Paper text:
The S2P spike glycoprotein was expressed in mammalian cells and purified using metal affinity and size-exclusion chromatography, following the general protocol established previously, maintaining the protein at neutral pH and room temperature. To determine if prolonged storage and transient exposure to mild acidic conditions are associated with structural changes in the folded spike, we used cryo-electron microscopy (cryo-EM) and single particle analysis to solve structures of the spike immediately after purification (0 day), following storage at neutral pH and 4 °C for about 30 days (∼30 days), and after a brief incubation of 12-day aged spike at pH 5.5 followed by returning it to neutral pH (12 days, pH 5.5–7.4). The three cryo-EM specimens were prepared at identical protein concentrations and vitrification conditions, and the same protocol was followed during the computational analysis. The final cryo-EM datasets for fresh, aged, and refolded spike contained 403,167, 95,641, and 252,067 particles, respectively, and the corresponding maps were refined to resolutions of 2.6 Å, 3.5 Å, and 3.2 Å. Overall, the structures of the three spike proteins were very similar (r.m.s.d. < 1 Å). We noticed that the number of intact spike molecules per micrograph was substantially reduced for the aged protein versus the fresh protein (average particles picked per micrograph using crYOLO software: 63 versus 243), and refolding via a transient exposure to pH 5.5 increased the average number of particles per micrograph to 174. While molecules of freshly purified S2P appeared primarily as compact, trimeric particles, unfolded species prevailed in the 8-day aged S2P, with the estimated fraction of compact trimeric particles reduced from 89% to 47%. However, differential scanning calorimetry (DSC) showed that storage at 4 °C in PBS for 8 days resulted in a drop of melting temperature from 65.1 °C for freshly purified protein to 47.9 °C, although the overall energy of unfolding, as calculated from the peak area, remained similar at ∼250 kcal/mol.
A major focus of SARS-CoV-2 research involves the trimeric spike glycoprotein, a type-1 fusion machine responsible for receptor engagement and viral entry into target cells. As is the general case for type-1 fusion proteins, the mature spike is embedded in the viral membrane in a metastable prefusion conformation, which undergoes large structural rearrangements as it transitions to its postfusion form, a transition that facilitates merging of viral and target cell membranes and virus entry into the cell. Two proline mutations, originally developed for the MERS coronavirus spike, have been shown to stabilize the soluble trimeric ectodomain in its prefusion conformation. When combined with the T4-bacteriophage foldon trimerization domain and a mutated furin site to prevent cleavage, the “S2P” construct has become the de facto protein format for research into the biological function of the SARS-CoV-2 spike.
Residue numbers in the entry:
A (entry chain B): 722 to 826, 855 to 1065
B (entry chain A): 919 to 1144
C (entry chain A): 574 to 620, 633 to 675, 689 to 721
D (entry chain A): 32 to 66, 81 to 95, 98 to 109, 115 to 121, 125 to 131, 167 to 172, 189 to 209, 216 to 242, ...
Amino acid sequence: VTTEILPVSMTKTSVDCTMYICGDSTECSNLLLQYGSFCTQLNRALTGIAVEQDKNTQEVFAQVKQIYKTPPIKDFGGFNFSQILPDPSKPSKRSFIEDLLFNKVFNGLTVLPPLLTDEMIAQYTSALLAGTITSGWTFGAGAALQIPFAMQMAYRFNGIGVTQNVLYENQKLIANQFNSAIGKIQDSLSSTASALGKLQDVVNQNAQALNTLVKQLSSNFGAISSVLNDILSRLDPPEAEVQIDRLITGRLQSLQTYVTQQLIRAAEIRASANLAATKMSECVLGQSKRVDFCGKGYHLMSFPQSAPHGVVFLHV
Amino acid sequence: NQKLIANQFNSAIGKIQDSLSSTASALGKLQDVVNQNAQALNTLVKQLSSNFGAISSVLNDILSRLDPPEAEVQIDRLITGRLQSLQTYVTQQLIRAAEIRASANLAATKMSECVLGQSKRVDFCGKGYHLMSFPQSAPHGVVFLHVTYVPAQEKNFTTAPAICHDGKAHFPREGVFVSNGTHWFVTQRNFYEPQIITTDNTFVSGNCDVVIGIVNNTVYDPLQPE
Amino acid sequence: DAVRDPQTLEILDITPCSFGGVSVITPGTNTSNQVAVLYQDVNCTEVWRVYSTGSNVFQTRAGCLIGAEHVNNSYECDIPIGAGICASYQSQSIIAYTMSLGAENSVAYSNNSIAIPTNFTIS
Amino acid sequence: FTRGVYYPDKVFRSSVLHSTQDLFLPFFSNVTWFHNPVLPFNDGVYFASTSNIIRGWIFGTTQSLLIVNNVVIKVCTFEYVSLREFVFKNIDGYFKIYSKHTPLPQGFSALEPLVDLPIGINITRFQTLLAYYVGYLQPRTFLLKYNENGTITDAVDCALDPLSETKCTLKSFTVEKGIYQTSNFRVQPTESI
Ligand SMILES: *[C@@H]1O[C@H](CO)[C@@H](O[C@@H]2O[C@H](CO)[C@@H](O)[C@H](O)[C@H]2NC(C)=O)[C@H](O)[C@H]1NC(C)=O
Ligand SMILES: *[C@@H]1O[C@H](CO)[C@@H](O[C@@H]2O[C@H](CO)[C@@H](O)[C@H](O)[C@H]2NC(C)=O)[C@H](O)[C@H]1NC(C)=O
Ligand SMILES: *[C@@H]1O[C@H](CO)[C@@H](O[C@@H]2O[C@H](CO)[C@@H](O)[C@H](O)[C@H]2NC(C)=O)[C@H](O)[C@H]1NC(C)=O
Ligand SMILES: *[C@@H]1O[C@H](CO)[C@@H](O[C@@H]2O[C@H](CO)[C@@H](O)[C@H](O)[C@H]2NC(C)=O)[C@H](O)[C@H]1NC(C)=O
Ligand SMILES: *[C@@H]1O[C@H](CO)[C@@H](O[C@@H]2O[C@H](CO)[C@@H](O)[C@H](O)[C@H]2NC(C)=O)[C@H](O)[C@H]1NC(C)=O
Ligand SMILES: *[C@@H]1O[C@H](CO)[C@@H](O)[C@H](O)[C@H]1NC(C)=O
Ligand SMILES: *[C@@H]1O[C@H](CO)[C@@H](O)[C@H](O)[C@H]1NC(C)=O
Ligand SMILES: *[C@@H]1O[C@H](CO)[C@@H](O)[C@H](O)[C@H]1NC(C)=O
Ligand SMILES: *[C@@H]1O[C@H](CO)[C@@H](O)[C@H](O)[C@H]1NC(C)=O
């Protein structure tokens, strides 16, 4: 049993262009109108990014029609799924592994909330697990058809070229090896390793860019000050024109650089989310023949778990 | 079932035709590309009526009102303002072209693997079990028509992993053992078609006290009178 | 963010004023002319007169929503507001609800039962 | 209802949606009904009337423009000789009269410019000269709709209600279903310290 982590979405931001360039200064915002429509371009670009971030999450996680439930009598041939099934004693839908995963990882600048909450994403992953464990690969092609778990496991052995008496005659050994591998996953996440590094990199790259954008407001760009009220209290209007123009030019260049790098960075989070949608459909809802697409070895089955802005797959 | 299968296919093609000729619009992914590119060109054209700090946004009536010392002072403001807007247009066109290229690469992969073959990848060529697909052309796009098999009208049974007959464990060659309540049969997995359990459709492996859940029944031997 | 009074030498804090954004939820204008108005994150105690006061006031995690009737059903999402809340047009008015993820289902699992399909459908 | 829209300039336009920022009579305002009290001239006046009793007008702060009625104007110096709706503006030493008359109803109509009288006086009040209304102009922003013949057939007041501000942001008169960012808000400071 191995692990694969993928980024899915990123943080939805919006920047108020007029307030960033000159908040509460009508003699600056009258000079800004001589540049046409730069601020509406910048707002339209950032809004397109924010909508795409909800679409990525929909297409990775909402791949079931029903909300399937697992039965209260848990007799799966000796296989133990309790570390990855949800625990209702804690008040969320979140499972044990997913608790570990969530514990491991103003000048006009706001953050918009996501459409799907963490509870909704956890309910989707638990329906995917319950569907897999009780009905094989049949719920991904039609209606879910129940089958005993060892018989499911027998025809998955049959799909990698091994006859099914090998499964039925080594059943207790196979269940013990599965349970120990899940236990080792749980231990190495519970230790202090830096496992969620791909998810941490996205958060760091988005924090550095907002800090650079805020720090650019204290440059004076050739003007006598970088505070706009100091200029408006010291100078007459015909001489304050040429100082406010220098500040406006520098601040527009700062916003334009930020939005260009956000568009390039969102283009690669799309590709990551399209890959995670493909892995959900081909490794969780089916059994895959593609070499190394779902782990290392001959693929038997995969399970999903939710993470902050990401997804974790466990490949058996 | 050939006549039933042909009639279900013909009805589904007719419903595709109906939900396109009705005004429920579905070509939204193709209309978005057109709208975004038209909007970008309209923004680039409207940026020629800004004065960027100069006395006029028209260049002929700077050149007709001023002398070459202080006409260049006004012309440099318009030059920098118009370069910046051309630069912004070109950069966002290069970012949109890369997304259209990734979509065209996916479409070329699907033409190879769903039209020129049958695919085992789940949900790549539609929902269900993939049979075949047909291409149709569209303005700046392509439409695929995927044909899939969907199981219907399921029914409960009782099952077992193996059968014990003469101190030996019997397993299916290709299928599952099912019971209607009193008798035991063997059927294929995706369609109910029950048959008698003989030695031609099972194989034997070991004695019958290792398997969890084995069932006593009779395995028939087809060379009976000899 | 802090300063000292030049007369009483008191340390007194500076904080900015309210400042949100404003969004307008609409159906099509070939359907109605009613709107609802969302204010981005302002606690509804700080907030045009008809669409600024009155009844139909609801506090979401996205902000303050004025002009929509909060109900207790759950529907498919129609117009997304954020953090689970959607809006739709349904005597006709505008309603705000928690979105629903789909139909509830439970599979009849046991250790010796199987479902086999008996027919099929071409799609 | 929807009255008192004129032509802002003298540029021909056809089948466009131009945005205008000028002094207009806001939609659904309250106009006084008269049936001759001396009225003030705030910054611009809508006038209508509904025979042949209304002759002309008296202008000025008490030099005082006089328009009587055959049309003769006696601005006091200069003299000029050349349902009924009228618009008066006193902008930058000029005096712009916009007017149109028809066969208050709901129908939309636009007032064409009549004459400019570049006089440069001060006016704070006025009075009619013998069923007439008085509106007052506000700084607005409209969204006019021209046609194939280059005539205005519709407009939108971009500060009446939220749907109108949505229509002015999208620059259309039909709005699809959705959610749209339109503006910002900010509490103003109450006093200085
Ligand atoms: C499935 O695994 C869990 C965790 O390993 C088992 O729960 C443990 O059960 C023992 C008793 O045998 C307790 O002492 C531990 O404290 C339990 N751990 C936790 C985290 O609850 C569970 O019993 C296993 N299920 C089966 C059927 O064996
Ligand atoms: C197969 O058998 C199961 C078990 O009897 C059926 O599931 C029950 O269906 C009834 C209504 O038909 C429900 O009231 C019960 O709650 C279900 N039981 C459980 C445990 O979920 C199932 O409907 C049968 N399927 C078919 C196709 O006949
Ligand atoms: C299970 O299937 C068997 C098929 O062999 C059914 O047995 C047949 O039933 C019909 C009707 O009574 C008889 O005409 C046949 O002679 C029977 N065949 C045999 C070999 O006995 C049986 O009825 C089915 N049981 C149930 C509960 O459906
Ligand atoms: C399945 O058949 C076998 C073969 O008869 C049964 O095993 C023996 O059955 C006899 C009676 O028929 C008993 O006296 C023996 O003690 C059984 N053997 C053992 C090792 O217990 C077996 O019981 C049958 N299974 C079921 C569930 O009835
Ligand atoms: C399998 O499904 C098909 C499709 O529904 C069934 O065919 C229909 O049968 C009904 C009679 O109950 C007719 O009224 C319909 O006209 C048939 N449809 C078509 C397209 O021919 C078929 O009978 C089912 N087979 C079985 C064995 O139940
Ligand atoms: C299946 O579960 C039932 C409990 O309802 C039990 O009696 C039976 O022994 C189990 N069968 C197997 C093969 O474990
Ligand atoms: C809104 O303000 C009240 C105090 O009047 C406070 O109790 C409440 O926590 C605030 N809610 C939010 C969401 O800020
Ligand atoms: C909605 O549910 C709440 C329960 O928290 C209840 O108090 C309220 O009355 C319900 N609304 C209606 C209209 O019944
Ligand atoms: C424009 O005016 C002409 C009159 O010359 C008329 O025939 C035509 O119908 C008008 N167009 C529209 C759209 O009303």
